[PDB]
Amino acid sequence: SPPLSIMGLMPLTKEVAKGSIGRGVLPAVELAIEQIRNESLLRPYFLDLRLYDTECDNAKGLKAFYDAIKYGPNHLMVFGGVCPSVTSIIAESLQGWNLVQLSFAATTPVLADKKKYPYFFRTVPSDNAVNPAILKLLKHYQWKRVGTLTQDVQRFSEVRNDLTGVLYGEDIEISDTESFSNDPCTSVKKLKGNDVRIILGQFDQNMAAKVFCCAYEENMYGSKYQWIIPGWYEPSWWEQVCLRKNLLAAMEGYIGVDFEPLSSKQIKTISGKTPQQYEREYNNKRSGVGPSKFHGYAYDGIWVIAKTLQRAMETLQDFNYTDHTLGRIILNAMNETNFFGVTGQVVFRNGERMGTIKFTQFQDSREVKVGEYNAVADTLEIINDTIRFQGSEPPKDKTIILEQLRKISLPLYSILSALTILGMIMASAFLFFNIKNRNQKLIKMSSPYMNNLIILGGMLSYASIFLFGLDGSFVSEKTFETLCTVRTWILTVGYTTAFGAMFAKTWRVHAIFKNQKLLVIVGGMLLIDLCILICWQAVDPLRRTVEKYSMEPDPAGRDISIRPLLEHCENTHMTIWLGIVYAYKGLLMLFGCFLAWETRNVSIPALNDSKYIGMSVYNVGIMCIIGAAVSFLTRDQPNVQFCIVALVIIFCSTITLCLVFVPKLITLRT
Amino acid sequence: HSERRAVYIGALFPMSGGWPGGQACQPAVEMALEDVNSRRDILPDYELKLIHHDSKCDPGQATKYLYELLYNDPIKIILMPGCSSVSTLVAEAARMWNLIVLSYGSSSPALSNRQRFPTFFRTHPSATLHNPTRVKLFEKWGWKKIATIQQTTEVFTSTLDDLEERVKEAGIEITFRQSFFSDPAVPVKNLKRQDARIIVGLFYETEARKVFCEVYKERLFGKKYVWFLIGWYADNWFKIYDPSINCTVDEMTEAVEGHITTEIVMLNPANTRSISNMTSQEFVEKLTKRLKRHPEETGGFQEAPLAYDAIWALALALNKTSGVRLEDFNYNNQTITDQIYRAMNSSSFEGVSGHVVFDASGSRMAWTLIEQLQGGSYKKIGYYDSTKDDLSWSKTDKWIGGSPPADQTLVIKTFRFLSQKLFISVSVLSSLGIVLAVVCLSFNIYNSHVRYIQNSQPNLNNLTAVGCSLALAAVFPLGLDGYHIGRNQFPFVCQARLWLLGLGFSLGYGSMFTKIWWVHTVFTKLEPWKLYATVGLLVGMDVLTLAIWQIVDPLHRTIETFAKEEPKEDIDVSILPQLEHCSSRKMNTWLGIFYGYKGLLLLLGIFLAYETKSVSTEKINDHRAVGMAIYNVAVLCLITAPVTMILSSQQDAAFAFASLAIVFSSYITLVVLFVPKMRRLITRG
Ligand SMILES: C[C@H](NC[C@H](O)CP(=O)(O)CC1CCCCC1)c1ccc(Cl)c(Cl)c1
Ligand SMILES: *[C@@H]1O[C@H](CO)[C@@H](O)[C@H](O)[C@H]1NC(C)=O
Ligand SMILES: *[C@@H]1O[C@H](CO)[C@@H](O)[C@H](O)[C@H]1NC(C)=O
Ligand SMILES: *[C@@H]1O[C@H](CO)[C@@H](O)[C@H](O)[C@H]1NC(C)=O
Ligand SMILES: *[C@@H]1O[C@H](CO)[C@@H](O)[C@H](O)[C@H]1NC(C)=O
Ligand SMILES: *[C@@H]1O[C@H](CO)[C@@H](O)[C@H](O)[C@H]1NC(C)=O
């Protein structure tokens, strides 16, 4: 039997860490070789794999490759290479001896460059082959805001750059990128700071425990955050020595992404077996050695080799590494391989394998499979029963905020409106009583027009409260913006008349003690206030403004916050107008109070209501300054400030009308 | 002569690719071997020979040729690779064959790793040899914060990560670091945004001709910026046609004028004889006779001295090792390689390229030529040797402003003071006013028994004049500032002026208001103690108010700054003005209540003085003039109390208004309250 020799470069030693790969895939290579021998696929020839030990050291690997080229038989292909530096050294030089290499464990993206490595193939998916699977999982769950937490080593930088390259053209945007080096818990000011919910991690095992500890220290875990990290960590990797009780709690439900060792289907493969039969017979051969996750790819690799040598034979031996056309023939024969193996459909696209990507999820003790991606068909499928979320629904990409205008309590508004309408009909009853007994001499002992202006101002101060009370949710927008002016017109006119009449009476009593035109003074006061108000409306009309609070409190918890906003009627520089009118009213009010104190024990038959008008001036003063102070001080909650202003206005006006009119009725009727 | 047992050297000369050095380093090697074979002093028994292959600077081909060199007929004693990638491959592999690797053209910092390449040597210095030079300039010109825009090649990354450690040993800081692939728009725009002054640009020529077109577009050149580039570009790299850029050759010359470049000195700048009896000029002349093309279009011409010196260092190491036999070298014995290593390590001689000594890591130490682009042509402004740390300046660095720019713009905190002229004028007016006040007080106290100035409350007008004098005395420390006082004595001056002005106003207006108040209250329905106790209680409550102010929230110095203005004494200086006040944490809230209290008392006084205008009483007979005194005092105080606050800035106008109000109030008060009361006693008795 004329042999067909194949060069197998693997680390087979005992001390090298990756030797476990080269000792766990040999059962599968023996299975494939013995089955190709029994089946007699290559009938006249027979396949002979010569094993050489590249200890994953560049120098030892190049010496093993050189000693194989010199002191070895005529090799037709190279099979293997598990470490990336040695595989790169050999793959770049293959074209000088016309050898075609097929790897099964070299996953580094670098080798995908077909200008430097035009003779390299691999049956294992690349490291950046998980990016389309992530893209499909995102477009499957509508996640569009994703934050990447990479690490500054070469491999993760290539995966990250290919992620940047593949999300181009799609509606998925990357909000932020973090590139920590050795301590990952400084991303707190950036990941949380931009408030990202879907995190794409690319970092090695020893940093994953630190990330999932800093996420517990920051509370980046729970029903609202998703972690999508690599899945090729060793089982029970979270045993690195927040405690384990909290590290597990912060790890609950992270999604790991990796390549699928064996296809789950049950179609008869090219070997005449199904993946489960191959797994059973492999574990029967894998007696004492360790089980390596690469065994199915080595099986499919030997089968690709056999099919390629067969297809190259039927298109036609002394090969001596100087034959260019035979190497080109084998290269064209390996570029159109297409069959079904134990790892799925083996087919190459520009030398790279188009395999299946497994999605798994951490569920309470261990990672369970929850879905699979298929790159040749580019379809994701997810096992709905297996996947679980801590929330009732899958997390959302972006938290949003809802307005929820701050309203005032309607029943409190109704109660205060009922008290004010009661007070208004009481004031109208007092005005009708005064107009009825007009010609009685005792009512003639007080200027009746002044008391009628007092009662008119009291009823207007009682009627302004209906406009002042409105929240803004009971009326339309622009009608509200043209109503904050009428409330202040009516309030200032009512106050100016109701106070100017009693001020007129107190000043006149004081001026006639020391020794018609009594109403002209309030006419001039209303004239100056009307001028002030028309200038106010003319130069800066009361506009409508709105303010926002903390945005923090969420009572219902729809994962969307609420934005408590409050309405107001202001203008550009309303502080100067408020100061002007408040000073103009307060100084005059104090002046009236002083005149009332100086003229307290006076007795004038023409104006007999001298003392009680003074008491009314005192109470109006106190209540108005307290009301203005509380109105300016408690703008926070509109319910309490509206309640206080309503109570103080109703109390001031009712006490004024009581002290003025009640005794001139009790002593007159009886 | 007869034995002449040959010793073989395997070499890889790149005749093409990224760096075609073998086009001129291979003839230089051949010539060198002649000089080692024609001289009977070195290696007379042995003869050095050369097997060589064309590598093309592609490690994929160098791997096959390394197989051919290590697995063919004659046993090699040393390997001589060229460019850096091939050198990395060969220097990592040769550990297994017990071979010395002696590169002549590799500049990668990565090759200075003695753990990966335990037997590597090179006559081409590492690219990090520029970094000791750059730091030497940053200490010479005093710059202490630096920006570093680079291209993302690994050689440039290793160079800059060495530069960081080289500067942080000296205290200099790298404030900005940017990396780009082909288009530097974003990096240079971030440099313009961050306002970086000293820049270190590490990129190849094609990237440079784009970086500097974007620098001309962004105006990141000029009088205040300096660029530190690499020196091995072509001497006209900014004048050649290039369609990938948009800036005519008349520009792209203006963006580069005045930038410093460091390069390695390959040839000897002297004209002395080397260890081969040949000068640099005649070595160049002799090499030019071998090349079949001109040395302007041949590659690797600037590195041929390094190949010559590598051949000579190898010859001298073999001449020092050999009674070790070199004809019985085989790839398994590691002793002969240790002999050649220990003789190669301790190497020191004079070659065409200068003094040849290696580090502990096998990289050669050399000189650095520092030059500067001046008017479109490079000019040599100095040399530097890092081993003995000797910088030889030539005094030719033509800067734009005479002196080199600085690392950042300095800010000078300028204090503002009120013009001393106005201060001293108002102070002399207040001094004549206070002497008039004490004259009037003495006049009033002299005539205590005339009984006409006893019908006017005398002690109350004495207290009015005393308060007026205290206000006129407190005008003084109100004008003092940092021009005279200084920091330590500031709070005492402000507290003193506060207490004096407060007590002066309180006592004056209290003595004038108690009179108006009691005339009114007796008119509407008289005793000395009640009259004195009322003003005593008033000034005592004000004193307690000011004491609680002091105790709960003392007044202390506070500086408030303005918008930056260009002062123009230098084209690039910026100064920010500062105004010094005395203020508490919430002076405005605390002062507002006091000003309102006093304003209410003043308005009450105006009203009472107008109400009791024509009333006549004999126990106080001067209220008719005290009323017009109060009107003026109140009008001036209630109008210059808010103006002193609205014009808190522009200290000159604030002082003017406040102090003119005080002095005019004082003058008119004392005049209208004492001129008649003395004129009626020098014309009517
Ligand atoms: C001074 C230096 N001498 C040779 C250099 O060390 C060879 P090297 O170390 O192999 C780096 C090369 C390879 C890629 C393209 C140019 C640089 C050098 C550096 C850059 C350039 Cl463009 C030249 Cl021509 C020479
Ligand atoms: C080609 O093969 C023959 C026999 O296998 C061998 O003798 C010859 O050396 C080979 N060619 C080269 C260039 O080695
Ligand atoms: C490799 O095969 C693909 C189909 O699988 C084909 O489209 C491509 O042209 C082939 N490459 C060649 C012939 O170089
Ligand atoms: C969820 O997955 C199960 C099993 O794969 C499938 O039967 C079911 O149809 C899926 N749900 C939807 C809505 O497709
Ligand atoms: C070469 O070695 C011999 C023997 O030690 C020594 O005498 C001679 O000086 C050496 N030549 C040179 C140039 O150093
Ligand atoms: C280059 O400059 C020319 C000036 O005429 C302009 O028309 C052209 O659009 C520019 N192109 C680019 C790429 O800036």
Ligand SMILES: *[C@@H]1O[C@H](CO)[C@@H](O)[C@H](O)[C@H]1NC(C)=O
């Ligand atoms: C070097 O060359 C000069 C030039 O003639 C000569 O004078 C000198 O003797 C030479 N030195 C030697 C050969 O050692």
Ligand SMILES: *[C@@H]1O[C@H](CO)[C@@H](O)[C@H](O)[C@H]1NC(C)=O
């Ligand atoms: C290497 O050469 C030395 C020369 O002295 C000699 O010991 C032997 O040939 C080799 N060494 C070994 C240990 O084989």
Ligand SMILES: *[C@@H]1O[C@H](CO)[C@@H](O)[C@H](O)[C@H]1NC(C)=O
């Ligand atoms: C290399 O030379 C240096 C300088 O003399 C010396 O300190 C060092 O020990 C030498 N290396 C060895 C391995 O002896």
